[PDB]
Design a protein around this ligand. Sequence first.
Ligand SMILES: [Ca+2]
Ligand SMILES: [Ca+2]
Length: 386
Amino acid sequence: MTLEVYIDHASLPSLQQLIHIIQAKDEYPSNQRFVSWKRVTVDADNANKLNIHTYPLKGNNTSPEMVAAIDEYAQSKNRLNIEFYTNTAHVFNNLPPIIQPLYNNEKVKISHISLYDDGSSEYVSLYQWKDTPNKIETLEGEVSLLANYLAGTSPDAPKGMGNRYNWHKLYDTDYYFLREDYLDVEANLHDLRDYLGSSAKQMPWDEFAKLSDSQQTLFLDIVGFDKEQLQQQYSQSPLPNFIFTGTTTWAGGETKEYYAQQQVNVINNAINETSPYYLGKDYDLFFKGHPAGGVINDIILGSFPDMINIPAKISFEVLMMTDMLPDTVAGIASSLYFTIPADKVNFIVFTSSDTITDREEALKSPLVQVMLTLGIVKEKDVLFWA
Ligand SMILES: [Ca+2]
Ligand SMILES: [Ca+2]
């Protein structure tokens, strides 16, 4: 048999994975699927339809429940191929708890590994690492370290990049990149590009359209996106559509109400003809808040009578994948903006902290520098707050 294992706490690997599962259900009807997701929830209803067995996560990562169930499923069969699907930044947290106890089992084969970028996280890390002396050499030497670590013959694990981009050396592995081209534009990462070779791939955004109506309905049901509704709302007025992406409480420790008020002021500046925040022309107002915004989201909506809400618990990345991105998007910088077309990104804002205290320091943060390099925003479109 073949067992498919899915592990993710975030949004993007899960969505890409859900696409794959709906496809695979039809190509491999006899396959069994174990899924540990957090941001996306498969009910017993749709689980029965995709041959999914759900297990909880321990925090963000693989749980003993999933492990014990994979062991149980293994010792039964005469022979087992296992396919892993997970989040790239958390790969080292998720796969070894499963691979170690299974390693000496003559009957079990790890036959494929698919890794998907969380979001900005991977790119911030590559940025900080890209100027590290003898980096590819170092990786090459950490291969044995990962191999021995997985085999349980040594207590030492590779630190850093070696526990992340060495998987394709031991296993048939695809690294699915949010932005594969970053390896090409950043010349400091050309040698990593050579190191990964064909194992590095680019995430597609248009798979959803190639599913049947019935498969799209299921996809949308599982992720909880009333797509037809939003399509209707976009057209309630003929003016172009603007989504302001909200955040939850940041540095300072104020009453959550204070943080809603400030975002309301950003929205107010964003409409104003006279602000450097001005979007460009008249737009219809939409809002997708943080899933934990709670009373932040309520106040933001209570401030704009004609504004229309997009359900906060949705993974915002769903939009881009189902062609439901609006004309323009703006808000406080977050991982979301790594999956949005540059001319759909109007501007991003940065806050205050004891770490980032002026605009200059915000412009040199890894996060901004990467977005600049990838072409997502220009510096004038990066803005700083109090
Ligand atoms: Ca490639
Ligand atoms: Ca409209």
